[PDB]
Amino acid sequence: LAERTTYSLNLEHELITLRKELEETKEALKKSVEESSNKDEIVSALHEDQQESTRMLASNEQVINSLKQKCR
Amino acid sequence: RTTYSLNLEHELITLRKELEETKEALKKSVEESSNKDEIVSALHEDQQESTRMLASNEQVINSLKQKCRQLGV
Structure with a gap:
């Protein structure tokens, strides 16, 4: 070249690398x-499954202790 | 410097800022x-445990109901 300043060419060099990096970072x-x-939705589903499981275990354990009482 | 260089400098300042925002x-x-990966992993472990404890509970409750059936209650 010759029509551009070396300084202008250096700025453009950084603009090449800067534009590539910015496009990649945006992607x-x-x-x-x-x-x-x-992952927000997966967490929410697992949380509700867990709450149901907790409800079932708590009912189970009450039934177990209650039946042990009834039949011993 | 020229007004051409000045334009390039303005574009550089603009993009550098935008890159730093985007990187952050x-x-x-x-x-x-x-x-959230750790959360999902932890929740999966918890539901494996719940599955075992539910199975064990099912066997115990069945044994009990049968014993109560033979005794009569």
């Missing part, structure tokens, strides 16, 4: 946010 | 997503 953000929002 | 957002998002 990584988009992918991470989706995955993190899918 | 990514850092936060990855940390959140990682903490």
Whole structure:
């Protein structure tokens, strides 16, 4: 070249690398946010399953102790 | 420097800021997503345990109901 300052060429060099890095970082953000929002729903489902399981175990244990009393 | 260089400098300042914002957002998002990985792993363990304890409970309650049936109650 010759029509551009060396200083202008150096700025443009950093602009190449900066634009590549910014596009890549934006893609990584988009992918991470989706995955993190899918994990929100999985957590919520497992939490409700856990609450049901807890309800069942607590009822079981009452029944076990109650039946041991009735039949001994 | 020229007004051409000045324009490039303005674009550089703009993109550098945007890259730093985006990188920080990514850092936060990855940390959140990682903490949820551990949560999901922990919950999966808990439900495996619940499955065993429910099975053991089923066998005990059945034995008991049968013994109460033979005794008569």
